[PDB]
Amino acid sequence: IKTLYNYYSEGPSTPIMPHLVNRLRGLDALAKIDATLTKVDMNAAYIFALRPTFPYSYGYKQRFSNRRLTTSAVCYARTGLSSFLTVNKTYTSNSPLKGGSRGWPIFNVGVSPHVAEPHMRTLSPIGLEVFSQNLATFSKTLLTASSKVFTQSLYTADILSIFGEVFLPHVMQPVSNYTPILVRALLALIHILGPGSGNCSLSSSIFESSIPQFFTVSHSTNMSNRTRYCLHTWSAYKDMFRNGIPPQSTLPPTLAPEGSSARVLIPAALVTSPMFPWLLALVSSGPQFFLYSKDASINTVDIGSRGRITSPIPDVANLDLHRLWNLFRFDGHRYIDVVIVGVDRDYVWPYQNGVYVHGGKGPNGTDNYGNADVHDGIGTIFSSFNDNVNVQTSDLILGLLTLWNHITTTYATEEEVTMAIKIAAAFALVYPVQPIVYSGCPRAFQSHTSYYQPSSENCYTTDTAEVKSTWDTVELSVQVNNAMVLGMTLPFGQPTVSSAQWFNNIDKAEISMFKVGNLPLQNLDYLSLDMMEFYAPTTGQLYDIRSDNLILSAHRTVNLGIGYTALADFFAYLASVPAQSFYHDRMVTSPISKQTYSVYERFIERFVDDFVGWDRCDLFNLDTLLAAKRIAGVASSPIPWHCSLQRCPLPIIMHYTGLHFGQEHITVRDVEGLQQIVMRNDQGKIVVDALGTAAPSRLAVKLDWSRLSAWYSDTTCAIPLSDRVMEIINYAAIWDPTQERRATGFVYTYFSPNFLSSFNASEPIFNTSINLTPPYDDTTVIQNLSMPQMLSFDPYYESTFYVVSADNEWIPTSGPAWKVPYLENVVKRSGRRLLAELRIASNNGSGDRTFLDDV
Amino acid sequence: KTLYNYYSEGPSTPIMPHLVNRLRGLDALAKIDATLTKVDMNAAYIFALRPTFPYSYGYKQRFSNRRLTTSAVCYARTGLSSFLTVNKTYTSNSPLKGGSRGWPIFNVGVSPHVAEPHMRTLSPIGLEVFSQNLATFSKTLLTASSKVFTQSLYTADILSIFGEVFLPHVMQPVSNYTPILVRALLALIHILGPGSGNCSLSSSIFESSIPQFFTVSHSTNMSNRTRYCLHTWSAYKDMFRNGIPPQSTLPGSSARVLIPAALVTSPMFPWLLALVSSGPQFFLYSKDASINTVDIGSRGRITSPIPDVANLDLHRLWNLFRFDGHRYIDVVIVGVDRDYVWPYQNGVYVHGGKGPNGTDNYGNADVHDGIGTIFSSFNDNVNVQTSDLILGLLTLWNHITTTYATEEEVTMAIKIAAAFALVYPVQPIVYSGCPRAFQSHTSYYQPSSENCYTTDTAEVKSTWDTVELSVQVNNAMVLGMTLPFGQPTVSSAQWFNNIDKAEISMFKVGNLPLQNLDYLSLDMMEFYAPTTGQLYDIRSDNLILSAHRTVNLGIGYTALADFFAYLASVPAQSFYHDRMVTSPISKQTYSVYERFIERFVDDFVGWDRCDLFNLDTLLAAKRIAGVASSPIPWHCSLQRCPLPIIMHYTGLHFGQEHITVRDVAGVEGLQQIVMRNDQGKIVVDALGTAAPSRLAVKLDWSRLSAWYSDTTCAIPLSDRVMEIINYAAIWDPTQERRATGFVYTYFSPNFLSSFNASEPIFNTSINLTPPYDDTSHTVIQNLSMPQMLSFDPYYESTFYVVSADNEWIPTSGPAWKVPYLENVVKRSGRRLLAELRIASNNGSGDRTFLDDV
């Protein structure tokens, strides 16, 4: 019903969570009906689904402008790493590379103790007859559905015996649930293709030109979450349970799934389906193999601060492009008995040569193989997943596209798909460490500060064609590499303490006992029973084109993940959670990190229960936050803790929350909100004597959300590019009476000039011909999308600080006297407009203002 | 309404709605009687692409017994019909008379906006597939419904192969065809050439008529070619697993078109591969420029072919544009055998068709670079008659409009194509200088001229034409050419000394939406029901009538753009080569010109403004190296169409009723202008009148007309002294030296001699010299817009029209030759002849007997 115009028109209400949850629900409903996913080209629908763009119009104002020509244009934010660039496995030489990490994080996911609640189902005509067999004394009239017309089918009497023997609970209580496998499918697709903005390294300059078309499969025993597979025919599998119960028996049915010792019944006609290898995955533990880009030279690109696109990044030779598939670890079933039904004693395993099914064809012409060999990993079978296998993107996703097409149409309901989308949105994206730039303090307060010099943190760029921003002063050493590797976050802000490292000729992984989350297991009994047509199908359709296709679903989960990130950033600027509380040294710099985590988890736990509907501890935990280690020789930058956990720019946060930061909140004219701040020294001489305005309290913002809009554009200044001196320092400072040295500056989480140059294109494609130059460029500002300073510098203590004038001739209530940014969301992507800001002199005569004043 | 109603009404205070409604009404009056296209192709071309705009003019003086012109009739035309350059084999470095050393390339990119597709109804096969995939099945491995599970979901065992391929479009039947109609209109207009017949930088070279023979040419460096891959349906199916993907892959294969074998042999097919590709894959020239080019003298003498025409090439406007379309196209051809022979080029083998040496089932899918490799009608050196090169375009337009398209798409295509329809040269401007009495109060004292270039030597050249076409001057004049909305170019091409080179910049002049070939394949494979009967406009199914509509719309666009530039006070020097180096005021004027254009485009065209007009090419000027700007004040507005066309499209009135006689008795309406020196001595103390402000013109539109009567003088031909300078000057308080003269835009005596013909045909027998009048032999004409009412785009100040010696009182009215104009309704003789042939004496038989419908 509602549209983007209605959402952009309205702002926050005093109950935020009842407002934010409803807004996110409406945004998801809008994401459902958006087209542009079926008729469009293949690698344009994929790029629109997985790399959504958020339009916005920037602009800044000045005090005394005389014929100032500005450009009103539209940019497109986008955030999230689409892949990860590391050094290749055969580098050696122990030398830094321009954008090549020595290792990558591993967001390991455990097994949930909670079980997804199954919903009712109805039996097939054959299933109802099994129910009659189990419910009544035997009679020949009970056998009503079985037949022998079709040979070796799912409708004879031996299938009836199977159903009555190993699936009695499901005959008595027909029930199923499919959200775990759907979650794993969504995560697999998203991680293989890569969501986000196209940035594919720890440096904000290297991007990914487009979605890759060719992958390579790599095997690594040391750092693979592999699971064991056994292959049997139904006859041999049943025969192995005759002379007692062997150890690790999968014979008894399962109602609450347990990690190890699972089994699945696979009909012979469905083994050959391309969906079978992906169905054995998405329920097993992963990743059993690593997926790389075939070529990192024709896919990775470099973006300059001014918008110059250089295709071959300096060190293409010694770099690998890991997909997000390799940055995630999932725990599923560790041992699976694949039992094939409707198969004689010469089956022959179709996929991998040298693999023999127990009870099938033997090695050399023999029949009824008598060995139940256990295969470690899904790569030992399913020849498509062997080592060094080059696959096209269509020949790898197709089976997935098949699997999702069947379950969502024949096996699962819409509620399961919605729950799967909501759960998978929690692990959808990976964000790099948050960079910040402290502006310093005015020279007037040089003697009243502990943080005088400007500084920067986590500001890393690798482009060398254009001018490098002075804020970016990060050199990729081993210690800095590890410190930033321990700094990536998930949509809810959870870090990871598990890492991997593959170089020289050695692969080594450190997986901690603490996990970033947990996922439910898929009950393989439901899968097996559905796959033998024991349950009645939910729908008679054949295609999911008109209802919840894989690409639209994945687009929905990516949208929900970006919404989770934006709302988490908003909650960070609701509980006064500093950015530095999520760095590598978060556990030793200050003991207030736990206090901040308390309020942050209070916000998150209320959001998850009100919107997601799943157990909160499975999606967010403090286990990885509290298990920080700190590298060693990495020192914290001298920056006060005054900025929140901003991971996505301000326009995305305003889109997902309704925050308004237009030019109506910038004061130009003027009754007494001012206060004179007086300070004397030991000689009794006044040394400050400056006007100031009190920063608003969170209660005041709660009762009036325009106070937060006015707080922005009062402490916000455009970030300079060539010099480390801001135009806000010359006029204003932060005065905190409770501090020993009461003056400070502004922290301003800072993305990049290259990153924002990547925002110019409406679609995340950058090869050579895309024009990333700023619109109507004339002449040194890096754009401010940073969220205002926190209204409180303590998670629990409420105290009032001030914005204090620094020169003499600036009155803080007369409006800011620098380059003051303003933002808008904008639905319709318009073109560049050359506007002029002038003085009003009562003789202002322009043709447009004279003749185009009708409307 | 008629032209008599529009010529009797003027502009109103709400001026954008007035102008837009007037333009819509004038569009409603563009009828060329399509029956004519079946009897007189050449007359239809002339009437469609070269509108006439008849007008009446006269001069009026006050105290002379001399008899001057009073009610003469002329016919005003705008635009370049073709371009004249040096030939590819020209080796020498000496300049040639009228031959440029390179032409601009108005490069157009791909619009990010996609034209919105409207609903379509499925054909019985499409409806079968739709009701098929919508049916409820029960999977079960016994039957084939289970094949979507046991086999990939892109299976063709439940649907057909075509149903599987077109499943997404069967689920959502939509289509849109304006991207191809825009290119068809542009192709026709650029091949034939619209406008006045002027075909060079010089205003004396003209095209004799619309050309009848073209020559193709190939250039590896300059052509914007695309790659084609030809297959058969059976061979195209076997490339993939067993069926072809619903969405085409990345690598050519960027686009795919399905053509039944019965439609390949149609003449529309080569023009269908074009108009969706990127162009121009080949260049078009006039066959022999020695017979289609004439030189027009000052008095009207049409001479022998161009003095150095043996070293010149007559480029068509086709060569002056660059479009970005699909770069890779798969031509599939469905319903053909394994012995299929490509019927358009020898040596071209279709994949799965006939092989090289009489073989069958050709196994290679060869990639052909450029539409010139296939379609031997577009080969390197091919002489093509006009009719058989335009027949394919006509058939394509008729078929698409009457089968696949709707009226809204055709109208949108016309309006979009009108923006790229015409090419204009640099604006020439004169400067009268200043009266001698103000010699010590001026910075621009000497009279001068800019971009005034003529090459005829048969008659006497006007004193205002002083341009010597050197290399730097050639480059500066080339970089001043503009589109109807005023967009110049920074790209160029040069084919000299057998060396061809194109400089294409990243800043385009505009964008056009891409054409979705999936809709094309669906319509041509009869999966959509044809849209027959959804064309309520009788001119939308021809092409020539449609092209006439877009040509008229483009002339209206440029007239309204000039009028907006006057309204927004945009100097004519903001569109030269040195627009960015001279003074930042150019961008300040752009900041209002953009608002005017954006309002007009958002109120009339309905398309995105950024596709039709940006400031990108304006803001990327190069200024050349050694061309110095003439000492002329920036008092002349941007103008490319003469005054009569401007007042035709806008409704302005400039008759003789606005000239005052007024024996002066009192002091009403006069001001005293004083300049005192350091010691307090008065040095000027002159009489003056206050120039009207734009606010007063908004509340009273007649004030502008009287303004035109107060500052306009007829331009002399053989002397650089304008009689207005003998009586009056401009006093600008915001100038350091406040005294200044008058500028005006000056076209040429030859360009106005070309206006003496009712139709743009000049070979030898046309008499362009006006007999019994002889006034034009000394005074040329003044077809310029009046002086700009403001010399500052942002702040309004009052300047004055001041007297030179106080003998002449400004209130008493002008003492010089005052021109007056009027729009007249006057059809041409050939137009009336065609009307008689197609309406009065039309027998036919399909209208006498097939009239019951």
PDB file of C-alpha atoms in Angstrom, chain A residues 37-46 65-69 150 153-155 210-213 267-270 272-275 392-395 398 401-403 405-407 409-411 531-533 537 539-546 762 769-773 776-778 829-841 843-855, chain B residues 13-17 112-113 130 132-142 145-146 148-155 158-159 164-172 174 241 246-251 253-254 506-507 516 518-519 522 528 567-568 584-585 587-588 590-592 594-596 598-599 603 608-610 613-616 619 694-695 697-698 701 790 792-797:
ATOM      1  CA  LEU A  37      14.154  -9.543 -11.574  1.00  0.00           C
ATOM      2  CA  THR A  38      12.633 -11.867 -14.225  1.00  0.00           C
ATOM      3  CA  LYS A  39      12.579 -10.279 -17.689  1.00  0.00           C
ATOM      4  CA  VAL A  40      15.893  -8.429 -17.256  1.00  0.00           C
ATOM      5  CA  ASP A  41      19.220  -9.899 -18.365  1.00  0.00           C
ATOM      6  CA  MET A  42      20.872 -12.491 -16.140  1.00  0.00           C
ATOM      7  CA  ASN A  43      23.837 -10.534 -14.753  1.00  0.00           C
ATOM      8  CA  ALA A  44      21.708  -7.425 -14.336  1.00  0.00           C
ATOM      9  CA  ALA A  45      18.900  -9.032 -12.343  1.00  0.00           C
ATOM     10  CA  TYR A  46      21.566 -10.647 -10.163  1.00  0.00           C
ATOM     11  CA  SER A  65      28.070  33.138  -0.589  1.00  0.00           C
ATOM     12  CA  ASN A  66      28.398  35.529  -3.540  1.00  0.00           C
ATOM     13  CA  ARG A  67      27.362  33.867  -6.821  1.00  0.00           C
ATOM     14  CA  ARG A  68      28.234  30.408  -5.501  1.00  0.00           C
ATOM     15  CA  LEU A  69      27.670  27.759  -8.181  1.00  0.00           C
ATOM     16  CA  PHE A 150       4.660 -49.603 -12.451  1.00  0.00           C
ATOM     17  CA  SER A 153       8.323 -47.257  -8.401  1.00  0.00           C
ATOM     18  CA  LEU A 154       7.255 -45.563  -5.165  1.00  0.00           C
ATOM     19  CA  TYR A 155       3.841 -47.271  -5.152  1.00  0.00           C
ATOM     20  CA  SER A 210      30.683  -7.256 -11.674  1.00  0.00           C
ATOM     21  CA  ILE A 211      29.417 -10.618 -10.446  1.00  0.00           C
ATOM     22  CA  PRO A 212      31.961 -13.297 -11.450  1.00  0.00           C
ATOM     23  CA  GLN A 213      31.166 -15.769 -14.207  1.00  0.00           C
ATOM     24  CA  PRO A 267      14.863 -42.233  -4.835  1.00  0.00           C
ATOM     25  CA  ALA A 268      16.956 -43.409  -7.771  1.00  0.00           C
ATOM     26  CA  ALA A 269      15.171 -41.098 -10.226  1.00  0.00           C
ATOM     27  CA  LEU A 270      16.225 -38.092  -8.106  1.00  0.00           C
ATOM     28  CA  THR A 272      20.620 -37.785 -11.179  1.00  0.00           C
ATOM     29  CA  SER A 273      18.917 -34.443 -10.513  1.00  0.00           C
ATOM     30  CA  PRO A 274      21.331 -31.470 -10.493  1.00  0.00           C
ATOM     31  CA  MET A 275      19.792 -30.419  -7.161  1.00  0.00           C
ATOM     32  CA  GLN A 392      30.727 -21.406 -14.941  1.00  0.00           C
ATOM     33  CA  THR A 393      28.361 -19.399 -12.752  1.00  0.00           C
ATOM     34  CA  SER A 394      25.340 -20.893 -14.540  1.00  0.00           C
ATOM     35  CA  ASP A 395      26.514 -24.510 -14.167  1.00  0.00           C
ATOM     36  CA  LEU A 398      21.470 -24.083 -11.479  1.00  0.00           C
ATOM     37  CA  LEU A 401      17.917 -22.676  -8.511  1.00  0.00           C
ATOM     38  CA  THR A 402      16.311 -26.081  -9.008  1.00  0.00           C
ATOM     39  CA  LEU A 403      16.266 -26.952  -5.305  1.00  0.00           C
ATOM     40  CA  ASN A 405      12.202 -23.987  -6.984  1.00  0.00           C
ATOM     41  CA  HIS A 406      10.971 -27.344  -5.686  1.00  0.00           C
ATOM     42  CA  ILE A 407      10.888 -26.896  -1.897  1.00  0.00           C
ATOM     43  CA  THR A 409       6.594 -24.872  -4.464  1.00  0.00           C
ATOM     44  CA  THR A 410       5.998 -28.491  -3.401  1.00  0.00           C
ATOM     45  CA  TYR A 411       7.304 -28.865   0.168  1.00  0.00           C
ATOM     46  CA  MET A 531      10.968 -36.895  -1.843  1.00  0.00           C
ATOM     47  CA  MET A 532       9.042 -40.202  -1.949  1.00  0.00           C
ATOM     48  CA  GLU A 533       5.673 -38.415  -2.398  1.00  0.00           C
ATOM     49  CA  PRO A 537       2.189 -31.386  -2.174  1.00  0.00           C
ATOM     50  CA  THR A 539       0.866 -26.478  -4.276  1.00  0.00           C
ATOM     51  CA  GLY A 540       0.272 -27.962  -7.710  1.00  0.00           C
ATOM     52  CA  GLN A 541       2.384 -25.327  -9.454  1.00  0.00           C
ATOM     53  CA  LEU A 542       5.590 -26.024 -11.369  1.00  0.00           C
ATOM     54  CA  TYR A 543       7.357 -22.636 -11.258  1.00  0.00           C
ATOM     55  CA  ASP A 544       8.024 -20.042  -8.553  1.00  0.00           C
ATOM     56  CA  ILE A 545       8.137 -17.158 -11.056  1.00  0.00           C
ATOM     57  CA  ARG A 546       4.994 -15.526  -9.652  1.00  0.00           C
ATOM     58  CA  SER A 762      23.663   3.985 -10.602  1.00  0.00           C
ATOM     59  CA  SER A 769      33.912   3.386 -19.562  1.00  0.00           C
ATOM     60  CA  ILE A 770      31.947   4.267 -16.417  1.00  0.00           C
ATOM     61  CA  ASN A 771      32.246   7.970 -15.589  1.00  0.00           C
ATOM     62  CA  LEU A 772      32.855   8.237 -11.839  1.00  0.00           C
ATOM     63  CA  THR A 773      33.892  11.898 -11.949  1.00  0.00           C
ATOM     64  CA  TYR A 776      29.798  19.438 -12.870  1.00  0.00           C
ATOM     65  CA  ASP A 777      33.244  19.439 -11.285  1.00  0.00           C
ATOM     66  CA  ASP A 778      34.886  22.867 -11.041  1.00  0.00           C
ATOM     67  CA  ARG A 829      16.973   9.368  -9.921  1.00  0.00           C
ATOM     68  CA  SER A 830      17.304  12.783 -11.570  1.00  0.00           C
ATOM     69  CA  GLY A 831      20.159  14.426 -13.451  1.00  0.00           C
ATOM     70  CA  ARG A 832      22.694  17.074 -12.532  1.00  0.00           C
ATOM     71  CA  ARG A 833      21.408  20.580 -11.821  1.00  0.00           C
ATOM     72  CA  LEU A 834      23.636  23.663 -11.747  1.00  0.00           C
ATOM     73  CA  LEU A 835      22.245  25.891  -8.992  1.00  0.00           C
ATOM     74  CA  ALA A 836      23.419  29.275  -7.739  1.00  0.00           C
ATOM     75  CA  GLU A 837      23.291  30.589  -4.178  1.00  0.00           C
ATOM     76  CA  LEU A 838      23.233  34.383  -4.004  1.00  0.00           C
ATOM     77  CA  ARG A 839      22.576  37.294  -1.682  1.00  0.00           C
ATOM     78  CA  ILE A 840      19.078  38.747  -1.378  1.00  0.00           C
ATOM     79  CA  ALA A 841      19.402  42.437  -2.259  1.00  0.00           C
ATOM     80  CA  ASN A 843      17.137  43.923  -6.882  1.00  0.00           C
ATOM     81  CA  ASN A 844      17.623  40.200  -7.560  1.00  0.00           C
ATOM     82  CA  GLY A 845      16.301  39.738 -11.081  1.00  0.00           C
ATOM     83  CA  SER A 846      16.572  36.415 -12.900  1.00  0.00           C
ATOM     84  CA  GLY A 847      14.596  35.082 -15.839  1.00  0.00           C
ATOM     85  CA  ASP A 848      13.545  31.876 -14.090  1.00  0.00           C
ATOM     86  CA  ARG A 849      12.336  33.731 -10.988  1.00  0.00           C
ATOM     87  CA  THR A 850      10.424  36.215 -13.171  1.00  0.00           C
ATOM     88  CA  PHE A 851       8.762  34.027 -15.818  1.00  0.00           C
ATOM     89  CA  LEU A 852       8.848  30.500 -14.323  1.00  0.00           C
ATOM     90  CA  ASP A 853       7.052  31.465 -11.093  1.00  0.00           C
ATOM     91  CA  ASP A 854       3.703  30.030 -12.239  1.00  0.00           C
ATOM     92  CA  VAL A 855       4.321  26.681 -10.526  1.00  0.00           C
TER      93      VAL A 855
ATOM     94  CA  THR B  13       1.923  36.424 -18.648  1.00  0.00           C
ATOM     95  CA  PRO B  14       1.986  32.681 -17.785  1.00  0.00           C
ATOM     96  CA  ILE B  15       4.427  32.057 -20.583  1.00  0.00           C
ATOM     97  CA  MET B  16       5.469  28.411 -20.274  1.00  0.00           C
ATOM     98  CA  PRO B  17       1.879  27.071 -20.582  1.00  0.00           C
ATOM     99  CA  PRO B 112      20.100   4.872 -17.816  1.00  0.00           C
ATOM    100  CA  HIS B 113      16.329   5.352 -17.781  1.00  0.00           C
ATOM    101  CA  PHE B 130       0.445 -19.111 -19.839  1.00  0.00           C
ATOM    102  CA  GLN B 132      -0.140 -24.242 -19.120  1.00  0.00           C
ATOM    103  CA  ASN B 133       2.498 -23.180 -16.596  1.00  0.00           C
ATOM    104  CA  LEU B 134      -0.298 -21.813 -14.379  1.00  0.00           C
ATOM    105  CA  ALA B 135      -2.047 -25.205 -14.243  1.00  0.00           C
ATOM    106  CA  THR B 136      -1.875 -27.324 -11.090  1.00  0.00           C
ATOM    107  CA  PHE B 137       0.064 -30.531 -11.459  1.00  0.00           C
ATOM    108  CA  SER B 138       0.999 -33.286  -9.105  1.00  0.00           C
ATOM    109  CA  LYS B 139       4.514 -34.018  -9.630  1.00  0.00           C
ATOM    110  CA  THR B 140       5.036 -37.814  -9.362  1.00  0.00           C
ATOM    111  CA  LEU B 141       7.870 -39.411 -11.225  1.00  0.00           C
ATOM    112  CA  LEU B 142       5.559 -41.421 -13.359  1.00  0.00           C
ATOM    113  CA  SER B 145       5.754 -32.840 -14.563  1.00  0.00           C
ATOM    114  CA  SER B 146       8.459 -34.208 -12.328  1.00  0.00           C
ATOM    115  CA  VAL B 148      11.409 -29.786 -13.270  1.00  0.00           C
ATOM    116  CA  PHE B 149      12.873 -31.640 -10.258  1.00  0.00           C
ATOM    117  CA  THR B 150      14.819 -34.595 -11.691  1.00  0.00           C
ATOM    118  CA  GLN B 151      16.061 -32.299 -14.483  1.00  0.00           C
ATOM    119  CA  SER B 152      17.042 -28.624 -14.439  1.00  0.00           C
ATOM    120  CA  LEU B 153      14.163 -26.189 -13.971  1.00  0.00           C
ATOM    121  CA  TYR B 154      14.861 -24.776 -17.457  1.00  0.00           C
ATOM    122  CA  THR B 155      13.340 -27.880 -19.048  1.00  0.00           C
ATOM    123  CA  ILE B 158       6.288 -29.662 -19.968  1.00  0.00           C
ATOM    124  CA  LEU B 159       6.188 -26.432 -21.967  1.00  0.00           C
ATOM    125  CA  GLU B 164      10.403 -22.247 -21.821  1.00  0.00           C
ATOM    126  CA  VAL B 165      12.449 -19.470 -23.441  1.00  0.00           C
ATOM    127  CA  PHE B 166       9.645 -16.884 -23.342  1.00  0.00           C
ATOM    128  CA  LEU B 167       8.295 -17.963 -19.941  1.00  0.00           C
ATOM    129  CA  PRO B 168       9.278 -14.736 -18.085  1.00  0.00           C
ATOM    130  CA  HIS B 169       7.706 -12.601 -20.820  1.00  0.00           C
ATOM    131  CA  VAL B 170       4.653 -14.866 -21.033  1.00  0.00           C
ATOM    132  CA  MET B 171       4.215 -14.309 -17.295  1.00  0.00           C
ATOM    133  CA  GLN B 172       4.493 -10.513 -17.745  1.00  0.00           C
ATOM    134  CA  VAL B 174       4.912  -5.979 -21.836  1.00  0.00           C
ATOM    135  CA  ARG B 241      22.794 -28.042 -22.849  1.00  0.00           C
ATOM    136  CA  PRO B 246      15.666 -17.241 -20.967  1.00  0.00           C
ATOM    137  CA  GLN B 247      18.189 -14.498 -20.117  1.00  0.00           C
ATOM    138  CA  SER B 248      21.061 -13.955 -22.544  1.00  0.00           C
ATOM    139  CA  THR B 249      24.544 -14.361 -21.080  1.00  0.00           C
ATOM    140  CA  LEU B 250      27.272 -11.700 -20.845  1.00  0.00           C
ATOM    141  CA  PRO B 251      29.627 -12.093 -23.821  1.00  0.00           C
ATOM    142  CA  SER B 253      25.680 -12.643 -27.213  1.00  0.00           C
ATOM    143  CA  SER B 254      24.773  -9.395 -25.404  1.00  0.00           C
ATOM    144  CA  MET B 506      33.497  11.015 -22.298  1.00  0.00           C
ATOM    145  CA  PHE B 507      30.967  13.893 -22.221  1.00  0.00           C
ATOM    146  CA  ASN B 516      14.821  -4.393 -25.807  1.00  0.00           C
ATOM    147  CA  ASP B 518      13.213  -9.572 -26.393  1.00  0.00           C
ATOM    148  CA  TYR B 519      10.060  -7.623 -27.272  1.00  0.00           C
ATOM    149  CA  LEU B 522       8.298 -11.983 -29.069  1.00  0.00           C
ATOM    150  CA  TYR B 528       2.056 -11.296 -28.509  1.00  0.00           C
ATOM    151  CA  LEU B 567      14.289  35.582 -21.396  1.00  0.00           C
ATOM    152  CA  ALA B 568      17.072  34.192 -19.187  1.00  0.00           C
ATOM    153  CA  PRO B 584      32.634  32.756 -15.238  1.00  0.00           C
ATOM    154  CA  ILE B 585      29.382  34.538 -16.255  1.00  0.00           C
ATOM    155  CA  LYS B 587      28.023  29.248 -15.962  1.00  0.00           C
ATOM    156  CA  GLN B 588      25.911  31.841 -14.143  1.00  0.00           C
ATOM    157  CA  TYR B 590      23.679  28.378 -17.677  1.00  0.00           C
ATOM    158  CA  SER B 591      22.224  28.209 -14.162  1.00  0.00           C
ATOM    159  CA  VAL B 592      19.030  29.854 -15.498  1.00  0.00           C
ATOM    160  CA  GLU B 594      18.987  25.019 -17.478  1.00  0.00           C
ATOM    161  CA  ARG B 595      15.909  25.897 -15.411  1.00  0.00           C
ATOM    162  CA  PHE B 596      14.099  27.164 -18.507  1.00  0.00           C
ATOM    163  CA  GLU B 598      14.133  21.711 -17.677  1.00  0.00           C
ATOM    164  CA  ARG B 599      10.697  23.280 -17.221  1.00  0.00           C
ATOM    165  CA  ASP B 603       6.050  20.142 -19.400  1.00  0.00           C
ATOM    166  CA  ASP B 608      14.001  12.785 -18.511  1.00  0.00           C
ATOM    167  CA  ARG B 609      15.826  16.083 -19.015  1.00  0.00           C
ATOM    168  CA  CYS B 610      19.320  14.649 -18.499  1.00  0.00           C
ATOM    169  CA  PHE B 613      20.001  18.478 -22.435  1.00  0.00           C
ATOM    170  CA  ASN B 614      22.941  18.621 -20.029  1.00  0.00           C
ATOM    171  CA  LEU B 615      25.644  21.207 -19.371  1.00  0.00           C
ATOM    172  CA  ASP B 616      28.426  18.631 -19.786  1.00  0.00           C
ATOM    173  CA  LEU B 619      31.429  23.048 -19.339  1.00  0.00           C
ATOM    174  CA  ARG B 694      11.826  41.842 -17.619  1.00  0.00           C
ATOM    175  CA  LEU B 695       9.153  42.430 -14.964  1.00  0.00           C
ATOM    176  CA  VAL B 697       7.691  42.890 -20.137  1.00  0.00           C
ATOM    177  CA  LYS B 698       6.039  40.152 -18.070  1.00  0.00           C
ATOM    178  CA  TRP B 701       4.462  41.973 -23.670  1.00  0.00           C
ATOM    179  CA  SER B 790      19.745  42.419 -18.695  1.00  0.00           C
ATOM    180  CA  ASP B 792      23.610  40.334 -15.399  1.00  0.00           C
ATOM    181  CA  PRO B 793      21.895  36.936 -15.012  1.00  0.00           C
ATOM    182  CA  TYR B 794      21.199  37.311 -11.275  1.00  0.00           C
ATOM    183  CA  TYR B 795      20.784  41.004 -10.395  1.00  0.00           C
ATOM    184  CA  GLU B 796      18.578  43.491 -12.237  1.00  0.00           C
ATOM    185  CA  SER B 797      19.865  46.981 -13.042  1.00  0.00           C
TER     186      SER B 797
END
